[PDB]
Amino acid sequence: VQLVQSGAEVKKPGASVKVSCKASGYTFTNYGLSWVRQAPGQGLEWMGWISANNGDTNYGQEFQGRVTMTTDTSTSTAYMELRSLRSDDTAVYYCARDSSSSWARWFFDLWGRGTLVTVSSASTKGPSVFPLAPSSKSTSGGTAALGCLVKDYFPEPVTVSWNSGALTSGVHTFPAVLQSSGLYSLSSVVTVPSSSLGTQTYICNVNHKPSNTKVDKKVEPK
Amino acid sequence: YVLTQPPSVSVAPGKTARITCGGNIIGSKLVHWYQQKPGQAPVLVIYDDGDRPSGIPERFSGSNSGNTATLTISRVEAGDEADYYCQVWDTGSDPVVFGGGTKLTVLGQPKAAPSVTLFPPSSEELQANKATLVCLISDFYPGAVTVAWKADSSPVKAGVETTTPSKQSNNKYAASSYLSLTPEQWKSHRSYSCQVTHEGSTVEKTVAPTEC
Amino acid sequence: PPSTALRELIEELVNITQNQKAPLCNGSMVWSINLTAGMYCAALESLINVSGCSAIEKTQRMLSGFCPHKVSAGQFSSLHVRDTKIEVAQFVKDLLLHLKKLFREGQFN
Amino acid sequence: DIVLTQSPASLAVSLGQRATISCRASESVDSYGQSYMHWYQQKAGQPPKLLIYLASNLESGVPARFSGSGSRTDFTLTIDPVQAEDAATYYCQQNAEDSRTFGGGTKLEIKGGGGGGGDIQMTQSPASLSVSVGDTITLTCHASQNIDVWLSWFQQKPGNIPKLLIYKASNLHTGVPSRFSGSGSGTGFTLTISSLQPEDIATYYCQQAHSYPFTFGGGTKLEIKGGGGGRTVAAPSVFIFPPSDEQLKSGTASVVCLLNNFYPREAKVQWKVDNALQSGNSQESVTEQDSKDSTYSLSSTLTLSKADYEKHKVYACEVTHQGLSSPVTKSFNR
Amino acid sequence: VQLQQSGPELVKPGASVKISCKASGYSFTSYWIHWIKQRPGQGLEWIGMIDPSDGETRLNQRFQGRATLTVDESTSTAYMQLRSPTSEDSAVYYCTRLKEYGNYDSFYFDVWGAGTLVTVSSGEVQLKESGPGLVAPGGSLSITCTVSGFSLTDSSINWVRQPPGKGLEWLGMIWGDGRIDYADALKSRLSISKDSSKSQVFLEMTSLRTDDTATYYCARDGYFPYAMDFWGQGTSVTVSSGGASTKGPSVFPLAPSSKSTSGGTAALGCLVKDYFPEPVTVSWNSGALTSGVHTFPAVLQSSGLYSLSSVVTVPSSSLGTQTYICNVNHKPSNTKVDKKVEP
């Protein structure tokens, strides 16, 4: 038994989104799904419940009216639809099995992986790729570390490789910062051994799935 | 409804950690529990305050005594360092009111000197008439950072970006800082630096446009 | 609404068993009962044998209110529950927990 | 505080009727479907006793006459029928609050006599008569109701089984001597026992055989009486006592000598305050005729002060009595 | 023509005792078996009648439900299965039948067996009361109810009051946990406390007025719904005029004569003084002394020492003296004293 949802989602302000959550491994007709959101770095917040036997719904004062819930008994998948999204509504929207009792709300046991729904005003702009070169050379006896500065890209995610997956010694991927312009920025740096100076070349491999921008960049010091 | 549990609990490994949800008459209601690891879906641990479902370890147990319910986790293990959300039922505003969140501050390892590096903007982008100063910090403990962009020892607040540190393989912390500037500003001043301080430990490097 | 009397009983039970109170009745043990979804009469006829202690009066009052016929304890299929002895605290905690479960289950009477 | 009123405050009802004692409350007393009212029964000089709890549940050891009812404002105590032994004041009491409060009381009794089927009762006198041995003793009897044919004349030795003397109030029993004869018709009778013997010094009772429950008489008793001359006259056993420390430490001293056993009563007690006699604070505590040998006991409590004793090394009490050939001096020293 | 009665039968509170009584020398199933309670401390009393040929019984008023007769025509035994007995039942219970000659002409009681002695054992739940009956108006009245047979931690005691002729009035209570209640009327001038060690409960009162004269009971509460089931007798309380003699008699010990200086028996005593009003109860060896006792009726003393009454008493015993200790009961002071003699 396992509860599964759709993939990630990216929306703009004022738009709408309809997320899915499929139930497989029990009798969906004898239970009711329930949604719980989670702002990044904040506590949980109950959003809505729906039953798979009668069709009743319940929402919180924060979401009473701004959301619409429905479920399909054919594929055992519910559809929570949020409209008039705001900048702060960016949060993972989990789903969980709950009792269909319209009077009480029991515990939650089955917890799907969830679905992140980011809301930003920036457009789906490709990533500006630049290599990271060491002004001062690698310290004596110590290992070096270079990477690629991914500036002004949106949305998430962006995987970063090195030499088409040929180098995996010291790779480090740091979280994406968010500037005031709304465009995410990322900078992954692989801890490169100083022994490979000069001789072994290094080519970054950034994959921007939104805009399909596959760009390989060469890096060299001063 | 209102529940106010402590937003932080610091305990030593191997001991018994106490996590209470100290609020109203929640003892008269079935207080459940929920554990959520960083980057994973929350999982059910304690429900009805005394019923653990299958797969749940045996060292878990919940207490409930009138005006105060408490979670009892013994033999603190770093593998269970996560956040615990006290959850209850109600018949007032909303039938479900979660808690404020409690991060189990397990004493994993002592202070660790961060690894800080800074890079000037790429000359290719300087040709394209932009300038982004980055400062990269990693491998420190605990999850606390203080960033300060001090160009020529002068603090700068315009075009400064920094996010909260995150986790990694060795359970340490890593955080990056961003400074958005313009080419003329980068070429004008004498020195540009980025300051990071952890628990009063000043660790800062500096670069210059005359060489970089 | 029928869900008012049960909520008031739950509030009273949680108010008399809080940790700020002294040991309830001070050690005088109480015969346990079978948790059989409607132990109202069972709890009444098993707490009817607590001489005073001045702290469980309202509890017995509300219990008799829920069970007006006060049917004799001879309904038990096994008097072994009237032979095992546990303190007032454990029995009242188990009764409170089962009553909270019954209240959450919608079952009031 | 809640107050409870009753109606009537006092009630007198004869036998065979149905009692009805109402207890009105100032407000409602019920709580969670049940009313916390009670009743009590208090007899003359007797303590109360629980009768009905929750105003609808009888207590163990309670006759079926008792009945309780009421709905949250009134409570009637129903006893049916009305019996003589039920004549006891009742008190309705509530405990539905933190402070109990008893009712106004309702004294119950039987009106116009009524009885319980002829409650005969005998009140005779005396209980112990002064009669010697070898004389005729005429005892007295007094009944309540009229029978005229049935009042037995029983007689029992102290600490033994009873013996009947006269049946039908005129016919002599089987084995009774002719020296005993009972007479009387109605309420007040008179017994005739002649030639009192050592085996005649016993107890005497009566009982009627007309209306059940057959009641028994009160009882006339006799143990011993009379006293001769020198036989009862005993040599006075003189006793004396030193001063008491509990009084000496208090600042005074009351001294007394004891004439334990002697006869007759005429014994002029005196005292010698260090060989000096004085008629002052010298009382004369006299006892009745001894129940063992008709002797006497007197103790002249010579109350005085510690100074009156701490200087007088001896205190000789003197007594002149018929049992004393010569006055026996009783004297302690210090 | 006689009856073989049983002997001593120790009875417990609530114990439905059943005594034996056997007939012999005639047909037991011919005449109505009669029951007559001796009760030596009161006189002679009746119980009821029953014919062993049919078993129908005509019991007395008090013995209608409390007593239960039995007639066995197969083994010549009459059971007396009285249930729920009281302290008044400790007595002898003779057997007899309807001894009658001439077709219900002369039915009398000539046969009398040994008498079934039925002594209900003492030691019941003791609701004992202790408190002075007379105090000066304005003093601090104190009463101490004593209870034995259990502990105060598992019961609750109330303070019911009853003025002479008037009705009852609740005046406080105390539980086994430590809660204390008071009537809303006298909530100020009243105070209650308990002591599980001494197994006693106190009582206080401020500014005693003459209306406060009333009997003070102390009753025990049973189980839920916590009504009152047990009842003591209550010590009397009277307040008419402030008596300066707020203390009992200071018992002066009077040791008897030495073992070597008494030609005859040796008698001891204790001079009673400084007590008012009359009388005061005095005994020796807690009542275990009756031979050669003599009590002098007290007489009002002279006007030199407040005329405090003085009673004298003396038991006579043979040399040497045994373990003799005085025992005094003073109802105006409720004080109990004792002392051994030492010549």
Side-chain angles (χ1 to χ4, degrees), chain D residues 1 34 36 38 40 42 45-50 53-54 59 85 91 93 95 98-104 116 119 150 154 156 160-164 167-168 173-174 205 207 209 212-214 216-218 239 241-247 250 252 254-256 258-261 281 283 285-287 290 292 297-299 301 303, chain E residues 34 36 38 42-46 49 58 60-62 94 98 105-110 112-114 158 160 162 166-170 173 175 179 181-184 217 221 224-229 231-233 250-257 261 265-269 271 273 292 294-297 299 301-302 305 312 314 316:
Chain D
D1 185 19
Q34 47 182 14
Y36 294 159
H38 300 295
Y40 292 106
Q42 180 183 41
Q46 290 278 344
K49 182 188 63 175
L50 185 56
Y53 56 105
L54 297 180
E59 191 72 15
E85 68 274 11
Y91 299 88
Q93 170 265 326
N95 47 3
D98 308 334
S99 45
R100 297 174 183 96
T101 290
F102 289 80
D119 299 87
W150 287 130
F154 274 88
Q156 179 201 49
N160 207 330
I161 67 175
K163 174 181 175 180
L164 188 47
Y167 77 100
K168 289 180 183 300
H173 207 193
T174 80
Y205 292 87
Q207 70 96 29
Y212 294 93
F214 287 171
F216 295 78
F239 284 80
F241 290 93
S244 71
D245 70 326
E246 197 156 334
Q247 192 174 5
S250 315
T252 175
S254 295
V255 196
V256 60
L258 160 65
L259 216 54
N260 184 29
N261 303 120
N281 185 20
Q283 70 94 58
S285 63
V286 301
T287 53
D290 288 0
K292 43 174 186 62
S297 200
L298 274 69
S299 53
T301 311
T303 308
Chain E
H34 263 269
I36 286 90
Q38 170 59 38
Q42 283 280 67
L44 189 44
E45 301 171 2
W46 202 62
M49 70 169 187
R58 187 176 183 174
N60 206 324
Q61 288 81 66
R62 283 83 58 197
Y94 281 84
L98 196 48
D105 164 69
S106 88
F107 40 95
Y108 48 86
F109 287 149
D110 71 330
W112 293 92
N158 310 331
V160 194
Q162 176 186 17
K166 300 297 299 178
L168 292 171
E169 185 177 6
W170 187 71
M173 78 167 308
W175 308 76
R179 191 174 172 193
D181 284 324
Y182 322 95
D184 302 2
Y217 293 80
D221 306 67
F224 191 83
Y226 293 158
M228 272 162 283
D229 206 302
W231 285 97
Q233 302 303 319
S250 291
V251 167
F252 298 141
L254 277 300
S257 86
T261 177
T265 77
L268 69 89
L271 194 43
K273 206 167 59 57
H294 292 331
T295 64
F296 302 88
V299 171
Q301 261 189 353
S302 87
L305 70 169
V312 191
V314 48
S316 285

Side-chain angles (χ1 to χ4, degrees), chain C residues 9-65:
Chain C
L9 182 141
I10 290 293
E11 289 276 330
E12 172 74 15
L13 266 294
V14 74
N15 197 24
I16 69 155
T17 60
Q18 40 195 344
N19 46 16
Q20 295 94 342
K21 304 303 179 178
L24 189 54
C25 176
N26 198 20
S28 158
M29 318 188 72
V30 181
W31 310 112
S32 198
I33 55 178
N34 288 314
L35 273 68
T36 51
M39 74 196 73
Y40 292 155
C41 56
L44 181 62
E45 295 298 329
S46 200
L47 215 63
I48 199 69
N49 294 334
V50 182
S51 159
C53 91
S54 200
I56 60 178
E57 180 161 357
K58 297 178 60 178
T59 297
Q60 295 145 349
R61 298 186 170 182
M62 297 176 185
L63 282 180
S64 45

Side-chain angles (χ1 to χ4, degrees), chain D residues 169-181:
Chain D
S170 279
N171 298 115
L172 191 148
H173 207 193
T174 80
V176 173
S178 315
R179 298 173 292 183
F180 317 97
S181 45

Side-chain angles (χ1 to χ4, degrees), chain E residues 25 28 70 78 127 181 231 252 330 333:
Chain E
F28 158 77
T70 318
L127 283 80
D181 284 324
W231 285 97
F252 298 141
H330 194 250
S333 159

Side-chain angles (χ1 to χ4, degrees), chain E residues 86-306:
Chain E
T86 178
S87 278
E88 300 281 346
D89 292 328
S90 279
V92 185
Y93 295 80
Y94 281 84
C95 307
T96 182
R97 63 170 168 89
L98 196 48
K99 174 56 190 59
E100 174 270 330
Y101 278 161
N103 185 350
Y104 282 105
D105 164 69
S106 88
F107 40 95
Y108 48 86
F109 287 149
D110 71 330
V111 56
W112 293 92
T116 299
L117 168 61
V118 178
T119 305
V120 183
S121 45
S122 199
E124 282 82 1
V125 183
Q126 306 297 312
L127 283 80
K128 288 310 178 183
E129 311 85 342
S130 309
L134 281 153
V135 289
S140 312
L141 192 145
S142 165
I143 305 170
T144 301
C145 183
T146 308
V147 169
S148 66
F150 55 86
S151 158
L152 269 300
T153 61
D154 206 5
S155 279
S156 62
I157 301 307
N158 310 331
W159 293 104
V160 194
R161 207 190 55 183
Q162 176 186 17
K166 300 297 299 178
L168 292 171
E169 185 177 6
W170 187 71
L171 288 178
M173 78 167 308
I174 181 162
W175 308 76
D177 196 13
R179 191 174 172 193
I180 302 100
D181 284 324
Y182 322 95
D184 302 2
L186 301 190
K187 195 194 294 301
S188 60
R189 298 189 295 112
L190 192 145
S191 305
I192 314 180
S193 314
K194 70 176 188 174
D195 186 292
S196 277
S197 87
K198 284 281 188 180
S199 64
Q200 288 172 348
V201 292
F202 299 152
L203 193 146
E204 317 301 324
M205 204 152 301
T206 301
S207 47
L208 274 297
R209 277 95 50 89
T210 68
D211 50 11
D212 305 318
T213 289
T215 305
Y216 275 85
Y217 293 80
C218 47
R220 184 200 101 170
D221 306 67
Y223 303 148
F224 191 83
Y226 293 158
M228 272 162 283
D229 206 302
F230 276 84
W231 285 97
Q233 302 303 319
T235 183
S236 192
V237 174
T238 45
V239 173
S240 78
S241 199
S245 67
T246 81
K247 183 206 163 184
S250 291
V251 167
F252 298 141
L254 277 300
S257 86
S258 159
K259 275 79 69 177
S260 43
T261 177
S262 159
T265 77
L268 69 89
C270 292
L271 194 43
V272 158
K273 206 167 59 57
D274 313 330
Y275 92 98
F276 178 86
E278 315 176 358
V280 58
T281 318
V282 286
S283 158
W284 307 101
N285 290 76
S286 316
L289 208 56
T290 312
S291 89
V293 304
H294 292 331
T295 64
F296 302 88
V299 171
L300 193 65
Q301 261 189 353
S302 87
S303 44
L305 70 169
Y306 191 63

